[PDB]
RNA sequence: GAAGCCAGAGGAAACUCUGGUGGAGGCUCGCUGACGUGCAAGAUCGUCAAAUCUGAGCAUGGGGGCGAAAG
């Protein structure tokens, strides 16, 4: 479940959480 | 203009050959000479029209050289067809290799040549001079410079590999690609390697007279015995060509591993994991041993390569065929499990964990770590027979991992242990309860083996640092794990 | 794109190679045995019907060692001869035959 | 819907031509040492014999 | 239950027949529309 | 190397014999001059040069 | 121009003179008063050659209809198939203008 | 506004890890330790400090040079004189020790210090063994 | 007793209902075992055996283990 969802490569771009 | 005159001749020849091609065998040579006009406008039109007509007139079989009335005319027409096609492919090859930069009046003549060559590959592979056609495409794929033509040539070969049902066209292209890769010392764009992953070989009462009825009865019996023999021969030829392609595909894979090309090893390991089940049993154990040597070499960048091999090793065993042959073929992943365990402490300090449908070739080392951990702790098979000591050892080390990793990596591990706690539960519950702590030894953090450490003799204390972590996602992630624990 | 490789596929050829690898017959011994009745036979300009007849009926009779035969079988073995799937079905087909034979006995 | 689910005389390539004027006009017409050669013959029959003897397998075919 | 089961098979059979001729009838019906309309 | 063994298994070397050299435990491989000698004898065309 | 050819075909029979079927068009061609002949695509080759021969000897223009006999009959508004058509009077259509 | 602040702080931190910006990188750590010490939030600098220690210059033997040691409070870059200087590698050497102690002394009392310091201890023993 | 067809009613139709014709595959009437899968502590699925009657002529097959089959 959660492990698979975070295992996809498009989770770790680098987008800052101030510029949403 | 003269282009109108040339256009009229093009329309004349093409329609004339479409309607009744046998009567005019010289139109193929006529399409040639009017193409040697020195205006680029007609040359573009001539090349496209030649592609159009040849797709119309090429038969469904090859024709042998003669050497040595209706029969004679067919011989002359077929001989004219081969001579024109041979000349056409030479002209297409010259234009493709010609200089691309020209006046910005549109796509150059080279782009049309690649378009024409790609169409012929997907339309008439069976016909003669397939190598000359495929050599145009492969020569484009040996340059390491992505442009529109490079993608077009790659897409054409992708289509050919996954639509080839016989195997002859696939084998000839695979031999060309393997030879080119060796000749370039593996300086290729790794989209050519992905072509190997697409190989499909590796995955109304009509009245009838008295004599008319007797001929059909004879024909049906002849066709029946021929169909039975054709079925048998098809199986043997398909298996033989599969072996030949498997020889070339696997030889290229291993020569890349031996030379250690950094930008190709991810693509190679995906291929090995995909096609290992198609080869002999005794070679399957060798693949695991070869993986161990690569890991041991890196133990002597480097973190990613060892994690790539570990991902491949588990993916090899996750196959159903390899899983059922665990006991018979002596496939033990204890080496990889231990090696993954002793590397967890070092991976925390690595700052490049985030510098980045595939199962092996993944660009993020953190993703590769999660795939290995999922294999060890959440296997597709025997998920509720996993040794509790192995679960506890990784669970404690993973909380230590979560302490000193980037925010997203820490969040990913936190989510992973949420699933681990949910699926197993009581096997790891004593780690978070101090009264259930074992008292038969002392915890050994830097053990050389998973069982060597005594993980049920310690307690997970890291929650008191991760509750004050700077990332709200991590704090919510930690609260997610305890909520699962409290619901156990 | 910018010498003929000799590939041994014959059982008798493997046998002679094994005798050279072992200290059984030396290079000098092989040259001496080459000067036999089959030596100095013309082949260059002779028709196929003449040559193919002799190739069928003029093959020297020489012993073949089991080690030479095994090496040829290993050398010519395909890469997809014994996958995990194929071996599994053969054993499964085996167990059925004894299972069915046991039923005919019952 | 259910219904839809040696050459003969043809006026296609004769139209707009002086041939059409000729045909439509309609007059009567009627249509009215070293043994090289010996070797080549011998090899020809040998190949035919080999092909014929191999073609009686139906798996060779 | 037997009433709907036979009705359900009948519905599937009629649906299969409709899916076979789902557009030929409309094309003929359309082509008949300009036939008697023509130029007026 | 394990990788070299896999390469040899997939594509057998020219001088591969399947034997083991007693002097050095590595596999015994024929050389080019030896392979020519087997080729000469098995065809018989040239028992000896010159 | 499939819509265009059908449009003039509908008007020509709705105003002018027309006959349908193989037997009627041969009589029209023999009469020498025919003006335009339409032959369906699925017409038997012997019937195509026969009609073209009579058309030439009468100098009656011939057109090869793209569709089949079924598509021809519906284009004419009739509920039956039709392989051959003979147009005797255009009526108020430009079918004979070209 | 703590989450966005340290995100951009570590971002401007990890832009280009080179010796030229080691003094620049050092100051960004001090800003983070002050924020973590005043509040009670965890900010992981163990990788950041050890990445300093495992660069090329502290592995390669230095060169004999004599000049004024640079004051690590007013510099955003390194003058070209310090590339293999004994003074520079000592100058960073005192720094990496200092922020490591400051980072570790902050959490020197929480229940989970031994595990919080275990990977750093192993790395430091490893680095000492190679040196 | 089904498709199919005819007639009437509701529905824009698709269709629904009623009354008929039609008589098909199919079903009916007369005097249990062996295995395989199982990813668990055995659930669910899949393969095979039981297979128109009869006169006069006629042909082929059969054991075991090893092996991927070819042998």
Short mmCIF file of N, CA, C and O in Angstrom, two decimals, chain B residues 345-346 348-352 355 396-397 400 402-407 445-446 458-466 468-473, chain H residues 2-3 6-7 10 14 40-44 46-48 50-51 54 104 107 110-113 115-123 125-126:
data_model
loop_
_atom_site.label_atom_id
_atom_site.label_comp_id
_atom_site.label_asym_id
_atom_site.label_seq_id
_atom_site.Cartn_x
_atom_site.Cartn_y
_atom_site.Cartn_z
N UNK B 345 23.49 1.23 7.71
CA UNK B 345 24.12 2.32 8.45
C UNK B 345 24.85 3.27 7.52
O UNK B 345 24.77 4.50 7.67
N UNK B 346 25.58 2.73 6.54
CA UNK B 346 26.34 3.58 5.63
C UNK B 346 25.42 4.38 4.72
O UNK B 346 25.72 5.54 4.38
N UNK B 348 22.65 5.74 5.34
CA UNK B 348 22.11 6.92 6.01
C UNK B 348 23.00 8.13 5.78
O UNK B 348 22.51 9.23 5.50
N UNK B 349 24.32 7.95 5.89
CA UNK B 349 25.25 9.06 5.77
C UNK B 349 25.42 9.51 4.33
O UNK B 349 25.98 10.59 4.10
N UNK B 350 24.97 8.73 3.36
CA UNK B 350 25.15 9.08 1.96
C UNK B 350 24.26 10.27 1.61
O UNK B 350 23.04 10.19 1.78
N UNK B 351 24.82 11.38 1.12
CA UNK B 351 23.99 12.54 0.79
C UNK B 351 23.29 12.45 -0.56
O UNK B 351 22.32 13.19 -0.77
N UNK B 352 23.75 11.58 -1.46
CA UNK B 352 23.21 11.50 -2.81
C UNK B 352 22.04 10.52 -2.92
O UNK B 352 21.79 9.99 -4.01
N UNK B 355 19.53 12.15 -5.49
CA UNK B 355 20.01 12.72 -6.75
C UNK B 355 19.43 11.92 -7.91
O UNK B 355 20.11 11.17 -8.62
N UNK B 396 14.38 -2.36 13.45
CA UNK B 396 15.18 -1.50 14.31
C UNK B 396 16.18 -0.68 13.50
O UNK B 396 16.36 0.51 13.75
N UNK B 397 16.83 -1.32 12.53
CA UNK B 397 17.79 -0.60 11.70
C UNK B 397 17.11 0.44 10.82
O UNK B 397 17.73 1.46 10.48
N UNK B 400 16.51 3.60 12.74
CA UNK B 400 17.79 4.30 12.75
C UNK B 400 18.05 4.96 11.40
O UNK B 400 18.59 6.07 11.34
N UNK B 402 15.72 6.07 9.34
CA UNK B 402 14.80 7.19 9.19
C UNK B 402 15.29 8.43 9.92
O UNK B 402 14.89 9.55 9.58
N UNK B 403 16.13 8.25 10.94
CA UNK B 403 16.58 9.39 11.74
C UNK B 403 17.45 10.33 10.91
O UNK B 403 17.34 11.56 11.06
N UNK B 404 18.30 9.79 10.05
CA UNK B 404 19.34 10.59 9.41
C UNK B 404 19.28 10.55 7.89
O UNK B 404 20.31 10.37 7.23
N UNK B 405 18.09 10.71 7.32
CA UNK B 405 17.93 10.72 5.87
C UNK B 405 17.07 11.92 5.50
O UNK B 405 16.36 12.48 6.35
N UNK B 406 17.14 12.37 4.23
CA UNK B 406 16.27 13.46 3.78
C UNK B 406 14.80 13.24 4.07
O UNK B 406 14.37 12.11 4.33
N UNK B 407 14.02 14.32 4.00
CA UNK B 407 12.64 14.28 4.49
C UNK B 407 11.81 13.25 3.73
O UNK B 407 11.04 12.50 4.32
N UNK B 445 24.41 -3.83 17.86
CA UNK B 445 24.07 -3.05 16.66
C UNK B 445 24.90 -3.43 15.45
O UNK B 445 24.35 -3.66 14.37
N UNK B 446 26.22 -3.50 15.61
CA UNK B 446 27.12 -3.73 14.48
C UNK B 446 27.44 -5.21 14.30
O UNK B 446 28.60 -5.61 14.23
N UNK B 458 16.05 -5.26 22.49
CA UNK B 458 16.10 -3.80 22.48
C UNK B 458 14.69 -3.24 22.32
O UNK B 458 13.72 -3.98 22.15
N UNK B 459 14.59 -1.92 22.37
CA UNK B 459 13.32 -1.22 22.25
C UNK B 459 13.48 -0.05 21.29
O UNK B 459 14.52 0.63 21.29
N UNK B 460 12.46 0.17 20.47
CA UNK B 460 12.49 1.27 19.50
C UNK B 460 12.31 2.58 20.26
O UNK B 460 11.21 2.92 20.70
N UNK B 461 13.40 3.33 20.41
CA UNK B 461 13.41 4.61 21.09
C UNK B 461 13.39 5.80 20.15
O UNK B 461 13.26 6.94 20.62
N UNK B 462 13.51 5.58 18.84
CA UNK B 462 13.70 6.66 17.88
C UNK B 462 12.46 7.53 17.72
O UNK B 462 12.57 8.61 17.13
N UNK B 463 11.30 7.09 18.21
CA UNK B 463 10.10 7.91 18.09
C UNK B 463 10.21 9.23 18.81
O UNK B 463 9.49 10.18 18.48
N UNK B 464 11.10 9.33 19.79
CA UNK B 464 11.24 10.56 20.56
C UNK B 464 12.05 11.62 19.83
O UNK B 464 12.01 12.79 20.23
N UNK B 465 12.79 11.26 18.78
CA UNK B 465 13.39 12.24 17.89
C UNK B 465 12.53 12.54 16.67
O UNK B 465 12.48 13.69 16.24
N UNK B 466 11.86 11.53 16.12
CA UNK B 466 11.06 11.74 14.92
C UNK B 466 9.75 12.45 15.22
O UNK B 466 9.11 12.96 14.29
N UNK B 468 9.66 15.17 16.88
CA UNK B 468 10.06 16.56 16.74
C UNK B 468 10.82 16.81 15.45
O UNK B 468 11.62 17.75 15.38
N UNK B 469 10.62 15.98 14.43
CA UNK B 469 11.24 16.21 13.14
C UNK B 469 10.63 17.43 12.47
O UNK B 469 9.44 17.72 12.62
N UNK B 470 11.46 18.15 11.72
CA UNK B 470 11.05 19.41 11.10
C UNK B 470 9.97 19.25 10.03
O UNK B 470 9.30 20.24 9.71
N UNK B 471 9.78 18.06 9.48
CA UNK B 471 8.84 17.88 8.38
C UNK B 471 7.49 17.44 8.92
O UNK B 471 7.41 16.38 9.57
N UNK B 472 6.42 18.20 8.71
CA UNK B 472 5.10 17.74 9.15
C UNK B 472 4.70 16.40 8.58
O UNK B 472 3.98 15.64 9.25
N UNK B 473 5.14 16.08 7.36
CA UNK B 473 4.80 14.78 6.78
C UNK B 473 5.42 13.64 7.57
O UNK B 473 4.78 12.60 7.77
N UNK H 2 8.54 27.06 9.78
CA UNK H 2 9.81 26.31 10.06
C UNK H 2 10.09 25.38 8.87
O UNK H 2 11.23 25.42 8.36
N UNK H 3 9.09 24.60 8.45
CA UNK H 3 9.27 23.66 7.30
C UNK H 3 9.82 24.41 6.08
O UNK H 3 10.90 24.00 5.62
N UNK H 6 13.81 25.68 6.55
CA UNK H 6 14.93 24.75 6.50
C UNK H 6 14.97 24.04 5.15
O UNK H 6 16.03 23.56 4.73
N UNK H 7 13.83 23.95 4.46
CA UNK H 7 13.84 23.39 3.11
C UNK H 7 14.72 24.22 2.19
O UNK H 7 15.62 23.69 1.52
N UNK H 10 18.49 24.05 3.44
CA UNK H 10 19.21 22.89 2.95
C UNK H 10 19.33 22.92 1.43
O UNK H 10 20.28 22.36 0.87
N UNK H 14 22.84 22.60 -0.27
CA UNK H 14 23.31 21.52 -1.14
C UNK H 14 23.35 21.91 -2.61
O UNK H 14 23.20 21.04 -3.47
N UNK H 40 12.61 23.18 19.65
CA UNK H 40 12.98 21.80 19.94
C UNK H 40 12.73 20.92 18.73
O UNK H 40 12.18 19.82 18.83
N UNK H 41 13.16 21.38 17.55
CA UNK H 41 12.96 20.65 16.31
C UNK H 41 14.24 19.95 15.88
O UNK H 41 15.34 20.46 16.09
N UNK H 42 14.08 18.78 15.27
CA UNK H 42 15.20 17.99 14.79
C UNK H 42 15.56 18.38 13.36
O UNK H 42 14.69 18.42 12.49
N UNK H 43 16.84 18.67 13.13
CA UNK H 43 17.35 18.98 11.81
C UNK H 43 18.58 18.10 11.60
O UNK H 43 19.58 18.27 12.31
N UNK H 44 18.56 17.15 10.67
CA UNK H 44 19.71 16.26 10.50
C UNK H 44 20.87 16.88 9.74
O UNK H 44 20.77 17.10 8.53
N UNK H 46 24.04 15.35 10.18
CA UNK H 46 25.11 14.36 10.25
C UNK H 46 25.68 14.07 8.87
O UNK H 46 26.90 13.99 8.70
N UNK H 47 24.82 13.93 7.86
CA UNK H 47 25.29 13.74 6.50
C UNK H 47 26.03 14.97 6.00
O UNK H 47 27.06 14.86 5.33
N UNK H 48 25.52 16.16 6.32
CA UNK H 48 26.13 17.40 5.84
C UNK H 48 27.54 17.57 6.40
O UNK H 48 28.47 17.93 5.67
N UNK H 50 29.54 15.17 7.75
CA UNK H 50 30.43 14.09 7.33
C UNK H 50 30.78 14.19 5.85
O UNK H 50 31.87 13.78 5.44
N UNK H 51 29.87 14.72 5.03
CA UNK H 51 30.20 14.96 3.62
C UNK H 51 31.36 15.93 3.50
O UNK H 51 32.21 15.79 2.60
N UNK H 54 34.61 13.87 4.27
CA UNK H 54 34.96 12.84 3.29
C UNK H 54 35.27 13.41 1.91
O UNK H 54 35.21 12.66 0.93
N UNK H 104 25.51 17.49 18.29
CA UNK H 104 25.29 16.29 19.10
C UNK H 104 24.99 16.65 20.55
O UNK H 104 24.30 15.90 21.25
N UNK H 107 21.07 17.15 21.41
CA UNK H 107 20.25 15.96 21.64
C UNK H 107 20.96 14.96 22.54
O UNK H 107 20.70 13.75 22.48
N UNK H 110 18.17 13.23 25.16
CA UNK H 110 16.93 12.56 24.81
C UNK H 110 17.14 11.04 24.87
O UNK H 110 18.27 10.55 24.82
N UNK H 111 16.03 10.31 25.01
CA UNK H 111 16.08 8.88 25.31
C UNK H 111 16.84 8.10 24.24
O UNK H 111 17.39 7.03 24.52
N UNK H 112 16.90 8.62 23.01
CA UNK H 112 17.39 7.85 21.88
C UNK H 112 18.72 8.37 21.34
O UNK H 112 18.99 8.27 20.14
N UNK H 113 19.56 8.94 22.21
CA UNK H 113 20.87 9.41 21.75
C UNK H 113 21.76 8.30 21.20
O UNK H 113 22.36 8.51 20.13
N UNK H 115 21.27 5.55 19.55
CA UNK H 115 20.91 5.23 18.18
C UNK H 115 21.04 6.44 17.27
O UNK H 115 21.37 6.30 16.09
N UNK H 116 20.77 7.64 17.80
CA UNK H 116 20.94 8.85 17.01
C UNK H 116 22.40 9.09 16.65
O UNK H 116 22.69 9.71 15.62
N UNK H 117 23.33 8.60 17.47
CA UNK H 117 24.75 8.80 17.24
C UNK H 117 25.46 7.57 16.71
O UNK H 117 26.66 7.64 16.42
N UNK H 118 24.76 6.44 16.58
CA UNK H 118 25.43 5.21 16.14
C UNK H 118 25.98 5.31 14.72
O UNK H 118 27.17 5.02 14.54
N UNK H 119 25.21 5.70 13.70
CA UNK H 119 25.80 5.76 12.35
C UNK H 119 26.94 6.75 12.24
O UNK H 119 27.89 6.50 11.48
N UNK H 120 26.89 7.86 12.98
CA UNK H 120 27.98 8.82 12.93
C UNK H 120 29.25 8.25 13.56
O UNK H 120 30.36 8.49 13.07
N UNK H 121 29.10 7.49 14.65
CA UNK H 121 30.26 6.90 15.30
C UNK H 121 30.95 5.92 14.36
O UNK H 121 32.18 5.94 14.23
N UNK H 122 30.18 5.07 13.68
CA UNK H 122 30.77 4.09 12.77
C UNK H 122 31.48 4.79 11.62
O UNK H 122 32.57 4.38 11.21
N UNK H 123 30.87 5.85 11.08
CA UNK H 123 31.50 6.59 10.00
C UNK H 123 32.82 7.20 10.44
O UNK H 123 33.80 7.19 9.69
N UNK H 125 34.86 6.23 12.96
CA UNK H 125 35.87 5.19 13.10
C UNK H 125 36.37 4.74 11.73
O UNK H 125 37.56 4.50 11.55
N UNK H 126 35.46 4.61 10.77
CA UNK H 126 35.86 4.23 9.42
C UNK H 126 36.81 5.27 8.82
O UNK H 126 37.86 4.92 8.27
#
